[PDB]
Amino acid sequence: AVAVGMIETLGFPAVVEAADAMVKAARVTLVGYEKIGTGRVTVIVRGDVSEVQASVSAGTESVKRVNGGQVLSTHIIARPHENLEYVLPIRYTEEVEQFR
Amino acid sequence: AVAVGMIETLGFPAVVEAADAMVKAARVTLVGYEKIGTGRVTVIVRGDVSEVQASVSAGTESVKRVNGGQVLSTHIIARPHENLEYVLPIRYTEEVEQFR
Amino acid sequence: AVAVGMIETLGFPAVVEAADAMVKAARVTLVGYEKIGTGRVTVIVRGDVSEVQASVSAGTESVKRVNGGQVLSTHIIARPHENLEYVLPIRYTEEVEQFR
Amino acid sequence: AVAVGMIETLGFPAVVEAADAMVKAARVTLVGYEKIGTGRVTVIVRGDVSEVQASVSAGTESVKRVNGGQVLSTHIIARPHENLEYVLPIRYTEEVEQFR
Amino acid sequence: AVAVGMIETLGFPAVVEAADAMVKAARVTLVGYEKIGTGRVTVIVRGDVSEVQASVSAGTESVKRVNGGQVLSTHIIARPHENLEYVLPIRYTEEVEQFR
Amino acid sequence: AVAVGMIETLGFPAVVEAADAMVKAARVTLVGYEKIGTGRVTVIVRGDVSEVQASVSAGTESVKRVNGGQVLSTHIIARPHENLEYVLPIRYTEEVEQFR
Amino acid sequence: AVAVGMIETLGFPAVVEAADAMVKAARVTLVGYEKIGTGRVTVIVRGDVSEVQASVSAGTESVKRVNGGQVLSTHIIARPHENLEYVLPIRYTEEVEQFR
Amino acid sequence: AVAVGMIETLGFPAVVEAADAMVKAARVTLVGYEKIGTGRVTVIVRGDVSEVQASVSAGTESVKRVNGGQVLSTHIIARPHENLEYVLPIRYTEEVEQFR
Amino acid sequence: MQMAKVCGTVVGTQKLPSMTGVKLLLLQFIDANGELLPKYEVAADPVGAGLGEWVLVNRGSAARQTEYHQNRPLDAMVVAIIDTVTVNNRRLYG
Amino acid sequence: MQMAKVCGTVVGTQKLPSMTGVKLLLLQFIDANGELLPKYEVAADPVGAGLGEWVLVNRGSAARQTEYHQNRPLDAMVVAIIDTVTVNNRRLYG
Amino acid sequence: MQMAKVCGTVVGTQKLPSMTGVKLLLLQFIDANGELLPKYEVAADPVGAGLGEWVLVNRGSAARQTEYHQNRPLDAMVVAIIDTVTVNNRRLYG
Amino acid sequence: MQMAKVCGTVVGTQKLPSMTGVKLLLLQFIDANGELLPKYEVAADPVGAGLGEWVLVNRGSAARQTEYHQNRPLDAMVVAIIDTVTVNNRRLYG
Amino acid sequence: MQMAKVCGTVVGTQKLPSMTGVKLLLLQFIDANGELLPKYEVAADPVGAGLGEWVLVNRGSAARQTEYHQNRPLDAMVVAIIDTVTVNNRRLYG
């Protein structure tokens, strides 16, 4: 399907700067926001592979300009399986259909 | 449009003193309140970027008077993307529109 | 019932790459996604035991592609009891019936 | 497609004993035979992933029967993409349709 | 026009795992397969340059799971000259036009 | 005759970057692609002496930007004898007469 | 018969510079071009024994102009048997009869 | 007009081998021959600047095969002034007009 | 510095290895009166700026001074997001 | 250097941390005859100049020579407040 | 940086010895709207770019930052091949 | 370098301390044919040049090369007084 | 770099001591199609170029990279004599 990028940060000010710099660097759609405990917070963007690679790489460098900000894990899946959108919270919601 | 500032503290008494020092120091509206686990609690203010910068600097110094709380991370975004208000809890709620 | 494969990772970008590697490696269906705290996130696949063994081993190696990703625990149950699908989130939901 | 097993040996007597051990150990079809230089010779079997795993492991142990035989590389792909059979010599030919 | 990416591995089981990981990771078409001697085997993918970059990086990491094979050289050309399709075997063949 | 330039590299991703950078640096025609064993691959360009000297010198520097790419030998013959086109594979084929 | 001169080099750019130096130095006809593996490439000239000796000596010294070029073996047969032209590729082909 | 290249050798057998290697390497015309004392002998070629550069580099390497001769000085001027043709002996003579 | 308006983003995947992680904004230059000039720039963006903002962008060797752009081939960099522009004691922007 | 007239100030709140404390002036370039050119600059101002003043502004890496602007991303700086300009032995300014 | 289109190649044989091995591309600048400007550049090309492509071109001493152009007399360099230009959330190129 | 004509002097008393002792000339650029262009510069003058002379003016960091302008905020400098301009083997100046 | 045509020479006798031995060429810029632009430069000429020749000239601090122009106040330098220009696979020059 449409490519998915994830940036996991330790902290909410670092994950908002990650989410803000991703949709400002390229034409991606921030679709998701996932908390899994112990402050590990992940934002999920969708878009083309050129946009997601540019957004995640620029979103990673912007978190290390935040005091107390730390990137735990970043990943880009260029072509996720269509099974993944129904189970994992990486799919487009109706709140973000204007940005697709 | 309206800037966003975040202060993440360790502990709830530290995050109320941070939130109280923010809306007293400048013309910002406390709109949000985020818990991500391990006691990491974030308050979100909205205002002009000059007012958000003065409030976040004042809310950081007020946690130092709370014994048992510390500022983990602060961040200020001058103009967040409109994708962020639909995914992240940084938007104006209808209960806080009297303070805008 | 049909076999269960589980990969538990520390982090959400590691669990989406593990889930995407699993359903691409073999004829398994990603049916489940479980958060239990401290960043321990588990994805659950269903399929034949040879396909589940081929997927779970392939999903473990793909977490090494993720920076900051770490597999905590993997397990494969070849023939789970029928009691487990009514209590534990290892069952086929209606949303994933197209991938079975 | 259906699964692919490859055993690469150094030497032609080792690759015929590997190919004969594979199709006797399980319900796989030897479909391919590839020379890439420096004595690196690869035989390719097709079958179900449980049969391919049982054959490729059994074809590796039978090269130890051959004096001067050495397994260089083994690999099993549980679900190869459909693009690979039109480029790589892993496909079923018309001569091996009686053994499928 | 369409970008070209190459992964050269030492060994045929490593070059099939590289080719299988490339067309699964992104929207590329495996079009070619080249042997130049000393066991050096090269697979050629065609796609967009962002998809080729995601394929070549995923195809490089998947050779590390093959015991006995190693990546010798990788390269990506964003837009090859039209001279290269007639001399070098990087062009789309009619057997693989269904995967374009 | 018309000048001939050769770049011999160890590896097929290095020889495609050599062939691509040669016809992009100057007005040369890639006419040939020569395998002599042990991975020694030679691409052959034709053109004017100013074009071939610029292409071979820029093609040599571009190969040492490829990982695993190594230039073995480069040469430019500014005025080859007309005996050499009938014996050696350095002549214009009909596939490359549009680029001359 | 008419004398045979052979220069064997390691590499294809060295063997074209050896062949171009031979037919310029004397009245020899380049008739042959032989690959035997491991990059050992041989060019074969025919002519009078004084011309073949003068060309093979001049073709050996011109490989030192090639960076990474190396002469492995040179030999001159002053009067080869007529059996040799029907087995070995040292004979005058019809394409090179204009240079005899 | 056309470029001018000079090779100064120590000795007359070295300057004839230098002049013979220049007009064989590229499309240059040997036009001149200059003696200035202390055995310093110069040959002057005219041609295009790329052809003059290829001839001077080949004429320098050919003096190394002469026992008792050495290259003292080489130079290439891409387009000499019209003043130099009337003062310095670098112009085309009447006898060399067949080789222009 | 020059005043510029963020008009878009430039994404390049085939680039130098020192150019990775660098966010590239397409900025159109604006005059002192506030009108868009027919002149643009592509600049690195360390100060996170979105589409429509007024930015200060420098030129040349000053783009390599922010201690992580130092050995990077950059000749333009957003150094500030403009809050307000006052011209002749009159607020023009903000 | 160029002659410029101080037309106003530019204030940015989100900037680089090395841009903190730098006073930013909006300078419109004037010609050799004293008329305003349709070209501007935003420059650092160590020499304290107010609105309407004639200044000399440099360009490029000369703005980073002031031993407190050295590692700052500045490509323009007011170096002097113009007292007088003489053109063809005739006083133009001052 | 500037956006440019590769319109051709420039080959010089008589040059400085530090200029050898440098691939020189004739690049015509394109505007932010996508049309060709009447302005060109000759730049070094480390990122292998062919005729017709859209490239990012830096100017000045940023061309000497890629650790092998360091002591080379280069004032322009292709730093990236443009994949996508998005202007006002609308894809212009790619 | 550019050819320029000395059209006057610029005197500033309120300046940087590193700008003292620097003689500032108002220089109008002339074209290759010899006419005055509508473009000027203010440059440091180490080579003593007076009103009406033809000078060669460099710009950028080349103005800081004469070992007493090294840490001075100068982006323009008279490097030569023009004796003769010969265009197409015809003397244009001198 | 820019493509320029050698239109003449500039001789200055009263100059800086570091400008001694520097051959100064008056170069008019040519466009990408080959016509003469109304813009010139005076550049140092280490690669010996005569009148009428097509040269590549750089600008700025790249003129000080040829290890004998390092501390010389030069902002322009002929780096190559153009042998051939190919535009859209068609030979424009040479």
Q: State the method.
A: cryo-EM
J2, J53, J46, J83: which is closest to L13 by C-alpha?
J83
* Whether H85 contacts chain F with CB within 8 A: no
CB C41 within 8 A of CB C19: no
H touches which chains (3+ CB pairs under 8 A)? F, G, K, M
CB I26 within 8 A of CB K93: no
User: What's phi and psi for B71, nearest 5 deg?
Assistant: -75, 125
Q: Interhelix angle for A12-25 vs A49-63, to 10°?
A: 140
CB-CB under 8 Å, F13 with E73: yes
Residue-by-residue DSSP string for F23-66: HHHSSEEEEEEEE-STTEEEEEEEE-HHHHHHHHHHHHHHHTTS
CA angle J49, J55, J57 (to 5 degrees): 110
Joined tokens for residue A95: 């709140």
Residues 6 or more apart whose CB falls under 8 angstroms from that of J6 comprise: J25, J26, J27, J49, J50, J51, J52, J53, J55
Largest CA distance in chain B: 37
Closest C-chain CA to A88: C33
* Whether B78 contacts chain J with CB within 8 A: yes
Joined tokens for residue M37: 């632009």
Length of chain D: 100
CB E90 within 8 A of CB E32: yes
L touches which chains (3+ CB pairs under 8 A)? J, M
Q: Interhelix angle for B49-62 vs B12-25, to 10°?
A: 140
Helix (H) / strand (E) element for B59: namely helix B49-62
d(CA H23, CA A65): 65
- The type of residue at G62 is S
d(CA H4, CA M9): 22
Q: What is the dihedral of CA F63, F65, F68, F70, to 10 degrees?
A: 30
Test mutation, G8, G16, G30, G45, chain F, max F CBs within 10 A: G16
For A13-52, b/e burial (b = at least 16 CB within 10 A) is: bbbbbbbbbbbbbbbbbbbbbbbbbbbbbbbbbbbbbbbb
User: What's phi and psi for H59, nearest 5 deg?
Assistant: -75, -25
Q: What is the dihedral of CA D76, D82, D85, D91, to 10 degrees?
A: 70
Chain I residues inside the 8 Å CB shell of J19: 79-80
Closest M-chain CA to K53: M88
Half-sphere exposure in the Cβ direction for M72 (13 Å, CA): 25
Give, in order, the Cα–Cα distances in Å from C15 to each of C41, C55, H56. 7, 13, 65
- The type of residue at J37 is L
* C-alpha distance across the termini of chain D, in Å: 14
CB J16 within 8 A of CB J69: no
* Whether F68 contacts chain E with CB within 8 A: yes
Please return the burial class of M17, using the count of CB atoms within 10 Å of its CB with bins 0-12, 13-18 and 19+.
Answer: exposed
Residue-by-residue DSSP string for G32-92: EEEE-STTEEEEEEEE-HHHHHHHHHHHHHGGGTSBT-EEEEEEEESS--TTHHHHSS-S-
d(CA H3, CA H78): 5
Q: Do chains C and D touch (3 or more CB pairs under 8 A)?
A: yes
Identify residues of M whose CB sits under 8 angstroms from chain F CBs: 83-84, 86, 89, 91, 94
Q: How far is CA E86 from the centre of its chain?
A: 18
D64, K44, G94, J74: which is closest to I56 by C-alpha?
J74
CB C99 within 8 A of CB A83: yes
Residues 6 or more apart whose CB falls under 8 angstroms from that of D4 comprise: D44, D45, D46, D52, D76, D77, D80, D84, D90, E16
Q: Interhelix angle for F12-25 vs F49-63, to 10°?
A: 140
**Count of other CB atoms within 10 angstroms of residue D85:** 18
DSSP G67: B
DSSP J59: E
CB F5 within 8 A of CB F29: no
A99, G64, G57, J53: which is closest to B87 by C-alpha?
A99
d(CA D28, CA I64): 61
- The type of residue at M23 is K
Residues 6 or more apart whose CB falls under 8 angstroms from that of I19 comprise: I12, I72, I73, K79, K80
Residue-by-residue DSSP string for J59-80: EGGGGG-SSSSTTS--SEEEEE
d(CA L74, CA J63): 8
d(CA M34, CA I94): 47
Chain F residues inside the 8 Å CB shell of M84: 27, 48, 50-51
d(CA E65, CA M71): 56
* Whether F11 contacts chain E with CB within 8 A: yes
Helix (H, G, I), strand (E, B), or coil: what is residue A23? helix
DSSP L35: P
Q: How far is CA H22 from the centre of its chain?
A: 7
Give, in order, the Cα–Cα distances in Å from A91 to each of A1, A41, A85, F40, F83. 10, 17, 5, 49, 66
Joined tokens for residue C51: 């396909």
| CA gyration radius, chain C | 12
**Count of other CB atoms within 10 angstroms of residue J55:** 26
d(CA J22, CA J19): 6
Pick from K9, K45, K48: CB nearest F27:
K9
Closest D-chain CA to E15: D88
d(CA B48, CA B54): 10
d(CA D94, CA E62): 31
Beta bridge partners of E10: E40, E70
Pick from K8, K16, K64: CB nearest M88:
K8
* Whether H49 contacts chain M with CB within 8 A: yes
Beta-strand runs (E) in chain A? 3-10, 28-35, 40-47, 71-77
Q: Sign of torsion, CA C96 D1 D3 D9?
A: negative
* Whether A48 contacts chain E with CB within 8 A: yes
CA angle B10, B15, B19 (to 5 degrees): 155
CB-CB under 8 Å, M26 with L81: no
Give, in order, the Cα–Cα distances in Å from B46 to each of B24, B32, F14. 13, 9, 55
Chain C residues inside the 8 Å CB shell of D79: 24-27, 54
CA angle H45, H48, H51 (to 5 degrees): 75
Q: What is the dihedral of CA E94, E95, E96, E97, to 10 degrees?
A: 40
Residues 6 or more apart whose CB falls under 8 angstroms from that of J90 comprise: none
Beta bridge partners of A24: none
Identify residues of K whose CB sits under 8 angstroms from chain F CBs: 9, 11, 13, 20-23, 45-46, 48-51
M55, K22, K70: which is closest to F25 by C-alpha?
K22
Give, in order, the Cα–Cα distances in Å from B90 to each of A61, A65, B5, J38. 22, 20, 9, 42
K touches which chains (3+ CB pairs under 8 A)? A, E, F, H, I, M
**Count of other CB atoms within 10 angstroms of residue M13:** 10
Beta bridge partners of C44: C6, C32
CB E54 within 8 A of CB A78: yes
CB G82 within 8 A of CB H86: no
Pick from E50, E55, E58: CB nearest A50:
E50
Half-sphere exposure in the Cβ direction for G21 (13 Å, CA): 29
Pick from I11, I48, I68: CB nearest A21:
I48
Q: What is the dihedral of CA B91, B92, B95, B97, to 10 degrees?
A: 180
Resolution in A: 2.6
Helix (H, G, I), strand (E, B), or coil: what is residue C39? coil
Length of chain C: 100
**Count of other CB atoms within 10 angstroms of residue B97:** 10
SS (H, E, C) C59-96: HHHHHHCCECCCEEEEEEECCCCCCHHHHCCCCCCHHH
CB L39 within 8 A of CB L62: no
- The type of residue at H21 is A
CB D31 within 8 A of CB D100: no
d(CA I75, CA I79): 12
Chain C residues inside the 8 Å CB shell of E58: 65
User: Which residues in chain M have their C atom more than 2.5 Å from the N of the next written residue, marking a break after them?
Assistant: none
User: What's phi and psi for G62, nearest 5 deg?
Assistant: -85, -15
Q: Do chains A and L touch (3 or more CB pairs under 8 A)?
A: no
CB B100 within 8 A of CB B92: yes
Test mutation, A83, A85, A90, chain C, max C CBs within 10 A: A83
CB-CB under 8 Å, K53 with E50: no
Q: How far is CA B67 from the centre of its chain?
A: 20
CA of M11 vs chain F CAs: smallest distance (Å): 33
Helix (H, G, I), strand (E, B), or coil: what is residue B56? helix
Q: How far is CA I1 from the centre of its chain?
A: 9
Q: What is the dihedral of CA J68, J72, J78, J80, to 10 degrees?
A: 30
K90, A3, F15, A100: which is closest to E51 by C-alpha?
A3
> With left for phi above 0 and alpha for psi between -120 and 50, is residue J54 left, alpha or beta?
beta
E30, K22, E37: which is closest to F9 by C-alpha?
E37
CB G68 within 8 A of CB G19: no
Chain J residues inside the 8 Å CB shell of B76: 14
CA angle C8, C14, C18 (to 5 degrees): 70
K33, L3, L22, D20: which is closest to L11 by C-alpha?
L22
